[PDB]
Amino acid sequence: MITAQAVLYTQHGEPKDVLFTQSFEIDDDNLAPNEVIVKTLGSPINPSDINQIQGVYPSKPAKTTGFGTAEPAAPCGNEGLFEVIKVGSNVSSLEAGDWVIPSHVNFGTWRTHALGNDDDFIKLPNPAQSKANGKPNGLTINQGATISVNPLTAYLMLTHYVKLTPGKDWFIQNGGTSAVGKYASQIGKLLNFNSISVIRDRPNLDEVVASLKELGATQVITEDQNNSKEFGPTIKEWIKQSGGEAKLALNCVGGKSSTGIARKLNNNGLMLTYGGMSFQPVTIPTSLYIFKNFTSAGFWVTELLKNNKELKTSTLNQIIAWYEEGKLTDAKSIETLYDGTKPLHELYQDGVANSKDGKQLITY
Amino acid sequence: MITAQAVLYTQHGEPKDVLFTQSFEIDDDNLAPNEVIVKTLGSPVNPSDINQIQGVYPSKPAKTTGFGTTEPAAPCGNEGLFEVIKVGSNVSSLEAGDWVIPSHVNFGTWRTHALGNDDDFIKLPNPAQSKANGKPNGLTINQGATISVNPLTAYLMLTHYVKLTPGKDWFIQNGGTSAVGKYASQIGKLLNFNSISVIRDRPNLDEVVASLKELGATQVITEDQNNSREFGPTIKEWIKQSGGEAKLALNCVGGKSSTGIARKLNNNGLMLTYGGMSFQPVTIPTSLYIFKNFTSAGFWVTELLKNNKELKTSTLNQIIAWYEEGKLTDAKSIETLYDGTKPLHELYQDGVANSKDGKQLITY
């Protein structure tokens, strides 16, 4: 038997209020033919995971007694990295030692172990396998545990919706220092797309600007410049002189910021909203729709890839390859190792509380 | 002290999600004068038990903390067979070794033992008692465990509502191979009622038709024949040539099936609906109401017998008699024995998931 720990809730609410830790047993000596047991290496805290516990995100795991609670309870977390420790007599796709991520959302990754079927998981290369394959880099734990949401989001928004002509066309984004924003700048560099990042002003602005330009942003402007009637024509010139067009905007902020990035598109532009900065609706002037033929749409990676294995696979492979090749870099997570000396749910509660410090990764 | 196990839920939902097993203690040295301890021999899984757990059946036991849970919990299952293991000093109606069923619904039969009062139970003859009383057969565990819903249902629909003239009149039923269907065919033979059973087509139709006719159906037709304009007059001839009338329809399917059987009744017919095949409302041509004085009503054994001990008794006594005399046969259940190597609730969960295989009886 294996003694595992899982972070559960029986009722929706704030994570500080409703999370608890449940001890449960996995029988590693009684695997059905297609079953696999995995041990968690690391899982992050994403806003979607929090929203899910809060009961305000319309994709969630069922509440059940399967972790040994009398009250139906749900697990937490939608992405993470695991290591296979044992497989059933009919599993060929996975082997002990393989690294895996969940093949689907709502699996529950804020826990020490899981029993599932082989098709509940997608194999990524472990560093030993990347090296054996002659790659310069194996994946880090953070890179594996955070590969499923933010990198795929950036890549798919940039390539799946409108075709940007390499060396000519532009995308514009707000939240330029966000995880997705930073991946989008790198991917624009890799694919030869021009881009403008819009960021909030700060004391070390010129420094942040240089850092984003190194990642791949062609130009970086402040939210004040995005708002600025005076500054607008300068942006028009950048795009005009390049020979291409600003065809795509990526919005994770809403409000004035979304208006600002939409205004900077050429006619027939598309905006994708993939996130929201608390309470702020997407605000677009009527004139853009009517006279510029602007279009505003959504992006949700969970829904897009729900029943599109081929698109997931192809996108995942590209992200893995770029990590192995050293061509893509993650932002560093704040990593908190689960010891057994402190209840697991408290580690994630702290992580929720300390969210603004940076991405929280609980490790094992 | 007796260590016992009960299948419970604290919240309604799917059995696969909300069931768990609770250990609890029964004090066998501390019986009140009218109390009785029993030990379960077997209890079936019926659709109403499932619908009760699901929270969509308007008859259910109260949730209490009486099994030693923190949250209020309900027990599961409404019928079953028990053996009396001890009685209090004022109990004359029962003795250790006796067989009993619950006297009322909502007792909770998916468990190893129960403490109740003597009027919580109804005595059935155990095999030893049946043979000692000169009868050719004692009841099987399956027969006792399933005596209280389906046999009483068939008996009462056929005798309690419209008086069918022995040797002449007809009833028609759909769900011909269901448990209730097969009891009704047998009761029709026993009481000398003519009957049509409507069934779904299958590769071994020849075998099923012969089986139903042996049980006592006068005629067996498929649902295609039930729907058939061409076939309709052939049925009218059966009835007409008999000198009797088709006075009663038993409906457990709804939809087109319910339409078809309604149309086969003579003037002044009565339909009883006692079940449905998921989301299919009872559908009756307007013309039958207006021009043929048709009536459609419902049957719910639980409600009919709730405050009618006399009718429940009389009916049960006849079914017991027929089983003892070898004049009634049950459909064989798929039996799963509880031996403590697998939690009891999982036995019931498997039985729910496997309901299509046939009637599931958990044994002890």
Structure tokens at A276: 């929201």
* Number of other residues whose CB lies within 10 A of the CB of residue A355: 14
| Residues in chain A closer than 8 A to B8 (CB atoms) | 70
Is the separation of the CB atoms in B15 and B82 below 8 Å?
A: no
**Per-position b or e across B215-243, b if 16+ CB within 10 A of its CB:** bbbbbbbbbebbbeeeeeeebeebbeeee
In the three-class reduction of DSSP (H, G, I as helix; E, B as strand; rest coil), residue B181 is classed as helix
How is residue A70 annotated by DSSP? S
The alpha carbon of residue A2 is apart from the nearest alpha carbon of chain B, in Å, by: 17
Catalytic residues of A: 57
Euclidean distance between CA atoms A4 and A113, whole angstroms: 6
Closest approach of B309 to chain A, Cα-based (Å)? 36
The answer to whether the Cβ–Cβ distance between A63 and B13 falls below 8 Å is yes
Residues 6+ away with beta carbon under 8 Å from B44: B77, B79, B80, B145, B146, B333, B359, B360, B361, B362
Beta bridge partners of A195: A171
* Both structure tokens of B2: 């007796």
DSSP letter assigned to residue A21: E
Nearest CA among A317, A315, A185, A313 for reference residue A250: A185
CB contact under 8 A, A65 and B16: no
| Cα–Cα dist B213/B189, whole Å | 9
Q: Please state, in angstroms and rounded to a whole number, the distance separating the CA atoms of residues A299 and A272.
A: 6
CA-CA distance, A199 to A196, in Å (whole number)?
Answer: 10
d(CA A137, CA A326): 7
A63, A64, A70 ranked by CB distance to B73: nearest: A70
Give the CB-side neighbour count of residue B357, counting CA atoms within 13 A.
Answer: 12
A297 interfacial to chain B (CB closer than 8 Å): no
Q: CATH number of the domain at A1-153+311-364, out of 3.40.1390.10, 3.90.180.10, 3.90.1150.10, 3.40.50.11060?
A: 3.90.180.10
Tell me how far the alpha carbon of residue A235 is from its chain's centroid.
Answer: 29
Residues B184 and A337: their CA atoms lie apart, in Å, by 66
Is there a contact between B17 and A70 if contact means CB atoms under 8 Å apart? no
Q: Do B18 and A70 touch (CB under 8 A)?
A: no
Helices then strands, each counted (H, E), chain B: 14, 16
Residue found by looking up tokens 């099936």 in the block: B257
As to burial, measured by CB atoms within 10 angstroms (0-12 exposed, 13-18 middle, 19+ buried), residue A317 is exposed
| Range list of H helices, chain A | 15-18, 47-54, 127-132, 141-145, 150-159, 179-191, 205-215, 223-227, 232-242, 255-263, 286-292, 301-304, 309-324, 344-353
> What is the distance between the alpha carbons of residues B156 and A315, in angstroms, rounded to a whole number?
64
Domain ranges of chain B: 1-147+333-364, 148-328
DSSP B57-113: SS--PPPBSTTS-SS-BEE--S--EEEEEEE-TT--S--TT-EEEESSSSS--SBSE
Q: Return d(Cα B182, Cα B184) in angstroms, integer.
A: 5
Asked whether the beta carbons of A200 and A220 are under 8 A apart, the reply is: no
Provide the CA A257 distance to its chain's centre, in angstroms.
Answer: 22
Q: Is B203 exposed, middle or buried (0-12, 13-18, 19+ CB in 10 A)?
A: exposed
Burial class (CB in 10 A: 0-12, 13-18, 19+), B70: exposed
Angle between helices B150-159 and B309-324 (to 10 degrees): 110
Choose among B11, B22, B345: nearest Cβ to A71. Answer: B11
B299 is in an annotated binding site: yes
What is the CATH topology of the domain spanning B1-147+333-364?
Quinone Oxidoreductase; Chain A, domain 1 (3.90.180)
- Return contacts of B227-233, CB within 8 angstroms, 24+ apart: B227/B256, B227/B260, B232/B263, B232/B264
Asked if B1-147+333-364 and B148-328 have one fold, the answer is: no
B71-100 exposure pattern, b = at least 16 Cβ within 10 A, e = fewer: eebbbbbbbbbbbbbbbbeebeebeeebbb
C-beta atoms surrounding B262 within 10 Å: 22
**A299: Cβ–Cβ under 8 A, 6 or more apart, which residues?**
A153, A156, A157, A272, A273, A274
Q: Entry resolution in angstroms?
A: 2.0
**A70 vs B13: CB contact, 8 Å cut-off?**
no
Residue of chain B with shortest Cα separation from A70: B20
Q: How far apart are CA A202 and CA A207, in angstroms?
A: 10
Residues 6+ apart with CB under 8 A from A347: A336, A338, A362
Beta-carbon contacts of A188 under 8 Å, excluding residues fewer than 6 positions away, are A158, A171, A194, A195, A216, A217, A218
- Residue A38's φ and ψ, nearest 5 degrees, are -125, 150
d(Cα B317, Cα B297) in Å, to the nearest integer?
27
Chain B residue at shortest CA distance from A71: B10
Chain A residues in contact with B71 by the CB 8 A cut-off are: 70-71
- The Cα–Cα gap between B15 and B45 comes to 11
Looking at residue B215, the DSSP 8-state letter turns out to be H
The Cα–Cα gap between B157 and B202 comes to 27
Helix residue ranges, H only, chain B: 15-18, 47-54, 127-132, 141-145, 150-159, 179-191, 205-215, 223-227, 232-241, 255-263, 286-292, 301-304, 309-324, 344-353
3-class state of residue A135 by DSSP: coil
Whether domain B148-328 has CATH 3.40.50.720: the reply is yes
Question: What are the residues whose beta carbons fall under 8 Å from the beta carbon of A20, sequence distance 6 or more?
Answer: A7, A8, A9, A345
B-contacting residues in A 52-71 (Cβ below 8 Å): 62-66, 68-71
Q: Does domain A154-310 have CATH number 3.40.50.720?
A: yes
For the record, the structure tokens of B325 come out as 């005399």
In angstroms, the CA B230 to CA B358 distance is 34
Chain A CB within 8 Å of residue B19 CB: yes
Min CA distance, A74 vs chain B (Å)? 10
Positions of B marked catalytic = 57
Distance from CA of B13 to the nearest CA of A (A): 9
